[PDB]
Design a protein around this ligand. Structure first.
Ligand SMILES: CCc1nc2ccc(OC)cc2nc1O[C@@H]1C[C@H]2C(=O)N[C@]3(C(=O)NS(=O)(=O)C4CC4)C[C@@H]3/C=C/CCCCC[C@H](NC(=O)OC(C)(C)C)C(=O)N2C1
Ligand SMILES: [Zn+2]
Length: 198
């Protein structure tokens, strides 16, 4: 009964989206074996770099984005799980199921994105495959893809950033608005709603 009750593992950083140069590309930093083991222990000694991490649990894989010293991701990916770190599991510092949002303190080595103050509606969504997709802002939390794509293409990218032209963070990718399997729009957690939650 009780003594046989299992614990859920930590979210584990398994790679990152490199946005540092002229070319955006994915990098894997940990394989499946290492991920499983890191998830169970919560101990992750790997070096962390950059703003957009690819993260994983035993069952799902998605993204997480650093903005103002917090690593943010989606609740429907992370639930209330801890994140693996060099000194063990780290407890969520923010949890809000109503905004589909969680966050932990940003891992040492990560770089954070600055929240946008530009007021601009020409946005760019960064996916787990390192595609930079033009998105026009359509409301507080909604944007339209300039070129619609099958949802398959966006799957696993929740937790990723929408950026403005200046590279400032505008929002965290939450949902794909689909019709007949085709995403024509996305929904995101506005950066201002992170700044309030904070
Ligand atoms: C309402 C927010 C929400 N919020 C949630 C909040 C709490 C919660 O607790 C368990 C669950 C929640 N699930 C929630 O919704 C779930 C999770 C989320 C979702 O699927 N998000 C994405 C993703 O990639 N996720 S992921 O793969 O990386 C996963 C994390 C590892 C973004 C990309 C989607 C790809 C197309 C997949 C087809 C699903 C269509 C769906 N569209 C839809 O719902 O649109 C409307 C709203 C118009 C109907 C939708 O997007 N989602 C459904
Ligand atoms: Zn901006």
């Amino acid at each position: 009964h009780m003594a046989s009750m299992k614990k859920k593992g930590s979210v584990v950083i398994v790679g990152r989206i490199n946005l540092s140069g002229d070319t955006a590309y994915a990098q894997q930093t940990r394989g499946e074996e290492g991920c499983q083991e890191t998830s169970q222990t919560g101990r992750d000694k790997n070096q962390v770099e950059g703003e957009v991490q690819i993260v994983s649990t035993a069952t799902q894989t998605f993204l997480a984005t650093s903005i103002n010293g917090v690593l943010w991701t989606v609740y429907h990916g992370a639930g209330t799980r801890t994140i693996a770190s060099p000194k063990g599991p780290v407890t969520q510092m923010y949890t809000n199921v109503d905004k589909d949002l969680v966050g932990w303190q940003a891992p040492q080595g990560s770089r954070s994105l600055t929240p946008c103050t530009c007021g601009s509606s020409d946005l760019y969504l960064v996916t787990r495959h390192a595609d930079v997709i033009p998105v026009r802002r359509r409301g507080d939390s909604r944007g339209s893809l300039l070129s619609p794509r099958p949802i398959s293409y966006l799957k696993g990218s929740a937790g990723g950033p929408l950026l403005c032209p200046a590279g400032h963070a505008v929002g965290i990718f939450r949902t794909a608005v689909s019709t007949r399997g085709v995403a024509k729009a996305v929904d995101f957690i506005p950066v201002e709603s992170l700044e309030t939650t904070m």
